[PDB]
Amino acid sequence: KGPVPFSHCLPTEKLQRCEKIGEGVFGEVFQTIADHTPVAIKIIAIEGPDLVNGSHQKTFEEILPEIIISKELSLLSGEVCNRTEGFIGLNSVHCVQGSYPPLLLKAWDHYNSTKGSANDRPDFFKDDQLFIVLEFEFGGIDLEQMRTKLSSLATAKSILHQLTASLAVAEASLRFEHRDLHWGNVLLKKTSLKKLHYTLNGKSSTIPSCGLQVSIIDYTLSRLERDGIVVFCDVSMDEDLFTGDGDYQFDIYRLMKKENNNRWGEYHPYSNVLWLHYLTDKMLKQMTFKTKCNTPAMKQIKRKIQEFHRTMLNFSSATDLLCQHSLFK
Ligand SMILES: Nc1ncnc2c1ncn2[C@@H]1O[C@H](COP(=O)(O)O)[C@@H](O)[C@H]1O
Ligand SMILES: [Mg+2]
């Protein structure tokens, strides 16, 4: 009958176990336990007139595309013709109303002490504030936090292959573009699987895991088609999105705008190639590997990833990269 109280999504025990694990301008991400297993809870303030982390809160209408796309992408793990585990599972979505729970404030504070925060301490929300609460599968640790923790160049290659395959499957199934695949949005989790499986237009293939499962998250800017309807975030009048600096990330928003001539409902899967290029650049420039790069085999992978960086912009889509680029043969 409209929203629910926080206690509906976060009963005492689950709340007591919350720890903050990440953030953005959108809001806040906490980890807790459900059914003997970690879960990730994304909490987004909506519909309020107050500026939050420097931005207006989204309306439900502005948030709805992320909710829809989160649900669609969550289905790809079981779909027959086009299948991948390379996105993230969605457990539930709720509209919650209330002030921030004190335990979540203490968890926010703990994070701000240890890691620091770009957001405002969430102690100003009133009893009538609305939030969207998205409960996700716990996907591991983000690539930015792993920038000194990858084992080898083989791991780098595996991550790029996994990312490309995931995006290709979503392209084939949904005419998907991610549109904000910064390295905070690539999650790494240890797996005992040696080979990872995907199906692309009815053809199943595998990818050497190198011990990790990659999960792509955060569909705040994403675009896809579902039942002939294009679901997307229209950023045609956003100015600030295109005036960032200090990181190649901020160039990608401008490069996408160039590619699509500011028509965000159209399908331009080249944007996926652009994000993969930005990620390749991070691997080559902002990362150090536990085993360094000390053997002929590892040195050759590095040269191959460098060549990928220098050639991949001449491919039309994640699908084109997957199916045609030498790095993945
Ligand atoms: N499903 C998830 N599993 C694990 N960590 C997550 C998940 N979703 C978000 N995070 C963390 O929260 C950060 C911000 O989330 P996002 O706003 O979606 O980029 C990410 O960089 C991750 O560190
Ligand atoms: Mg970045």
Tell me the H-state helices in the chain.
Answer: 6-9, 12-16, 60-75, 102-114, 153-174, 248-260, 270-285, 296-311, 318-324
3-state DSSP assignment of residue 193 = coil
60 is in an annotated binding site: no
CATH 2.30.140.10 fits 139-329, yes or no: no
**Secondary structure (DSSP) of 128-178:** T-EEEEEEEE---EETTTTTTT---HHHHHHHHHHHHHHHHHHHHHH--B-
The experimental technique behind this entry is: X-ray
Nearest-angstrom CA–CA distance, 161 and 323: 11
Is 142 near ligand 1, meaning CB less than 6 Å away? yes
Amino acid (one-letter) located at 43: I
Residue 244 in tokens: 């960032």
Q: Which tokens is 200 given? A: 């692309």
Shortest-distance Cα residue to atom 17 of ligand 1: 24
- Other C-beta atoms closer than 10 Å to the C-beta of 60 total 12
Starting at the edge strand found earlier in the chain, the sheet holding 37-46 runs 19-24, 27-34, 37-46, 130-137, 90-97
Among residues 109, 180, 247, 320, the one annotated as catalytic is 180
Instruction: Specify the DSSP element, H or E, that contains 200.
Output: strand 195-200
Cβ(39)–Cβ(136) below 8 Å: yes
Tokens standing for 309?
A: 């960086």
Residues in the chain followed by a break, C to N above 2.5 angstroms:
none
Cβ 177 under 6 angstroms from ligand 1: no
Return phi, psi of residue 12, to 5°.
-40, -55
Per the structure block, which two tokens stand in for 296?
């002929």
DSSP state of 293: T
Q: Bridge-partner residues for 22, per DSSP?
A: 29
| Resolution, expressed in angstroms to one decimal | 1.9
Burial class (CB in 10 A: 0-12, 13-18, 19+), 181: buried
Angle at which helices 270-285 and 153-174 cross, to 10°: 170
Residue 229 to residue 219: CA distance in whole angstroms: 17
Alpha-carbon distance of 27 to 100, in angstroms, equals 12
Ligand 2 center to residue 317 CA distance, Å? 21
Selecting from 3.30.230.10, 3.40.50.300, 3.90.950.10, 3.30.200.20, what CATH number does the domain 1-138 have? 3.30.200.20
Using CA of residue 247, residue 249, residue 252, residue 253, what is the dihedral sign?
A: negative
The number of CA neighbours under 13 Å toward the Cβ of 310 is: 6
Token pair in block for residue 127: 């009893």
Per the rule left: phi > 0, alpha: psi between -120 and 50, beta: everything else, 152 is beta
Q: Domains of the chain: which residue ranges?
A: 1-138, 139-329
Phi-psi map region of 118: left, alpha, beta (phi>0 left; psi -120 to 50 alpha): alpha
State how beta strands 141-142 and 195-200 pair: unpaired
Residue 298: burial class (beta carbons within 10 Å; 0-12, 13-18, 19+) = middle
Based on the residue annotation, tell me whether 180 is a catalytic residue of this protein.
Answer: yes
Six-digit token string for 78: 């079981």
| Total length of the chain | 329
